[PDB]
C-alpha cells in the first residue's frame, strides 16, 4: 500500500529540520544516515528534512516537529509521502526576511547577528516559504524564507552570501507564531497531557 | 535489497557520485583526484557539518571511531 506513505505523529526531537523513522522502515525506503528526504504533504506542498532512526517510531507512523507538520499542511493522524532526494543542490542565493512582530522594539543589524550563525556551518535543507525559529541566539526569533536560488527548495550553503533586506514582512493567517504556547512550553506535566 | 544511491555534497549541489558496492578510501580519493583534480594528501573526508569547526578543531578520526555508515553523506 506504498511504504513511502506514513502517518505523521509527534517527535521527541525539537529539531526544526529533522524527522524520525523506524530502522525497519528506513531499510524499506533505502535511507542512509544523514540523508535528505523529501516529505510531500497536502495542498501540493513538500518539505525537505533529515531522517533519523528512532525505536520509538511505529511501522506506519513518522515522527516530525510541529513546524514541518504545519508547513506540510498536515495534522495529527494525516498521511504524508517520504522520498529520498536523488538530486539536490546548494542554495547559490538565500533571501530571508524577519517578521514585523519579531522586530518590535529592536533596530540595527540582524544580518550579522542572526541571519548568519544559523546558516554558517549549519547545512540544513529549506524550502521557499518555510519558517524557522532561532533559539540559539539569546531570544527566539522567527525568520521566514522568502526564496532561494533553486526553486522551490535547496540546502543552506554557508559559502553563499545570505541577503536580508531591511524590510520586515507581515505574518500570514495560516502561519502561526512560534511564540505560541505548545506542548514544548509545558514542563513536568507529561502524563497530565 | 541494497541500492547504492550515495550522494556527495558539493559546492554546486548534492549529486549521486559514481560509487560501487564496495570500495575503500583510497578508491574514493582517486576519484576526486580526477573528477575535481584534488590530491590524496589534500582532500579531507568529513561526514558531518560544522564546516567552520573543521579548521584545526576537527581532530577526530574518520576510522572505526566515528563509525561511517554504508552511504554516509560527505559534507563538503
From Swiss-Prot, chain A:
UniProt keywords, alphabetically: Acetylation, ATP-binding, Autophagy, Cytoplasm, DNA damage, DNA repair, Endoplasmic reticulum, Hydrolase, Isopeptide bond, Lipid-binding, Methylation, Nucleotide-binding, Nucleus, Phosphoprotein, Transport, Ubl conjugation, Ubl conjugation pathway
Gene Ontology CC entries for this record: ATPase complex; ciliary basal body; cytoplasm; cytoplasmic stress granule; cytosol; Derlin-1 retrotranslocation complex; endoplasmic reticulum; endoplasmic reticulum membrane
Name this polypeptide is given: Transitional endoplasmic reticulum ATPase
Subcellular location, principal: cytoplasm
Full-sequence range covered: 21 to 213 of 806
Species assigned in the record: Mus musculus (Mouse)
Family (UniProt): Belongs to the AAA ATPase family.
Keyword hit for Translocase: no
Quaternary organization: Homohexamer. Forms a ring-shaped particle of 12.5 nm diameter, that displays 6-fold radial symmetry. Part of a ternary complex containing STX5A, NSFL1C and VCP. NSFL1C forms a homotrimer that binds to one end of a VCP homohexamer. The complex binds to membranes enriched in phosphatidylethanolamine-containing lipids and promotes Golgi membrane fusion. Binds to a heterodimer of NPLOC4 and UFD1, binding to this heterodimer inhibits Golgi-membrane fusion. Interaction with VCIP135 leads to dissociation of the complex via ATP hydrolysis by VCP.
GO biological process assignments: aggresome assembly; ATP metabolic process; autophagosome maturation; autophagy; cellular response to arsenite ion; cellular response to heat; cellular response to misfolded protein; cytoplasm protein quality control
Localization (cell): Cytoplasm, Cytosol; Endoplasmic reticulum; Nucleus; Cytoplasm, Stress granule
Source lineage: Eukaryota, Metazoa, Chordata, Craniata, Vertebrata
Function summary: Necessary for the fragmentation of Golgi stacks during mitosis and for their reassembly after mitosis. Involved in the formation of the transitional endoplasmic reticulum (tER). The transfer of membranes from the endoplasmic reticulum to the Golgi apparatus occurs via 50-70 nm transition vesicles which derive from part-rough, part-smooth transitional elements of the endoplasmic reticulum (tER). Vesicle budding from the tER is an ATP-dependent process.
Tissues/organs with expression: Expressed in the prefrontal cortex (at protein level).
Modification sites for Phosphoserine: 17
Membrane-crossing residue ranges in chain numbering: none
Free-text comment about domains: The N-terminal domain shows evolutionary conservation with that of PEX1, and is able to bind phospholipids with a preference for phosphatidylinositol mono- and bisphosphates. The PIM (PUB-interaction motif) motif mediates interaction with the PUB domain of RNF31.
PTM field: Phosphorylated by tyrosine kinases in response to T-cell antigen receptor activation. Phosphorylated in mitotic cells.
Keyword Nucleotide-binding set for record: yes
UniProtKB/Swiss-Prot annotation, chain B:
Domain of life: Eukaryota
Subcellular location: Cytoplasm, Cytosol; Endoplasmic reticulum; Nucleus
Coiled-coil portions: none
PTM-bearing positions, type N-acetylalanine: 1
Function: The ternary complex containing UFD1, VCP and NPLOC4 binds ubiquitinated proteins and is necessary for the export of misfolded proteins from the ER to the cytoplasm, where they are degraded by the proteasome. The NPLOC4-UFD1-VCP complex regulates spindle disassembly at the end of mitosis and is necessary for the formation of a closed nuclear envelope. Acts as a negative regulator of type I interferon production via the complex formed with VCP and UFD1, which binds to RIGI and recruits RNF125 to promote ubiquitination and degradation of RIGI.
Subunit structure: Heterodimer with UFD1. The heterodimer binds ubiquitinated proteins. The heterodimer binds to VCP and inhibits Golgi membrane fusion. Interacts with ZFAND2B; probably through VCP.
Homology family: Belongs to the NPL4 family.
UniProt note: domains: Binds ubiquitinated proteins via its RanBP2-type zinc finger.
Protein name from the UniProt record: Nuclear protein localization protein 4 homolog
Organism: Mus musculus (Mouse)
Lineage: Eukaryota, Metazoa, Chordata, Craniata, Vertebrata
Parent-protein residues present: 2 to 77 of 608
Amino acid at each position: 500500500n506504498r511504504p513511502n506513505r506514513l502517518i505523521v505523529d509527534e517527535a521527541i526531537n525539537e529539531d526544526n529540520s529533522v524527522v524520525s523513522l523506524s530502522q525497519p522502515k528506513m531499510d524499506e525506503l533505502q535511507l542512509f544516515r544523514g540523508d535528505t528526504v523529501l516529505l510531500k504533504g497536502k495542498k501540493r506542498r513538500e518539505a525537505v528534512c533529515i531522517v533519523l532512526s528512532d525505536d520509538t517510531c511505529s511501522d506506519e507512523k513518522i515522527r516530525m516537529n510541529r513546524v514541518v507538520r504545519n508547513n506540510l499542511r498536515v495534522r495529527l493522524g494525516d498521511v504524508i509521502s517520504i522520498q529520498p532526494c536523488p538530486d539536490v543542490k546548494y542554495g547559490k542565493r538565500i533571501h530571508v526576511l524577519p517578521i514585523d512582530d519579531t522586530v518590535e522594539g529592536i533596530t540595527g543589524n540582524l544580518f550579522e547577528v542572526y541571519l548568519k550563525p544559523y546558516f554558517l556551518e549549519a547545512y540544513r535543507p529549506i524550502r521557499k516559504g518555510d519558517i524557522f525559529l532561532v533559539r540559539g541566539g539569546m531570544r527566539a526569533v522567527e525568520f521566514k524564507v522568502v526564496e532561494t536560488d533553486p526553486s522551490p527548495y535547496c540546502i543552506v550553503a554557508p559559502d553563499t552570501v545570505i541577503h536580508c533586506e531591511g524590510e520586515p514582512i507581515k505574518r500570514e493567517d495560516e502561519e502561526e507564531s512560534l511564540n505560541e504556547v505548545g506542548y514544548d512550553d509545558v514542563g513536568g506535566c507529561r502524563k497530565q497531557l | 535489497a541494497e541500492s547504492i544511491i550515495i550522494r556527495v555534497q558539493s559546492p554546486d549541489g548534492v549529486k549521486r557520485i559514481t560509487a560501487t558496492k564496495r570500495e575503500t578510501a583510497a578508491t574514493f580519493l582517486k576519484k576526486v583526484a580526477k573528477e575535481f583534480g584534488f590530491q590524496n594528501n589534500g582532500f579531507s573526508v568529513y561526514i558531518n557539518r560544522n564546516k567552520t569547526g573543521e579548521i584545526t578543531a576537527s581532530s577526530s578520526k574518520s576510522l572505526h571511531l566515528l563509525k561511517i555508515k554504508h552511504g554516509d553523506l560527505l559534507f563538503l
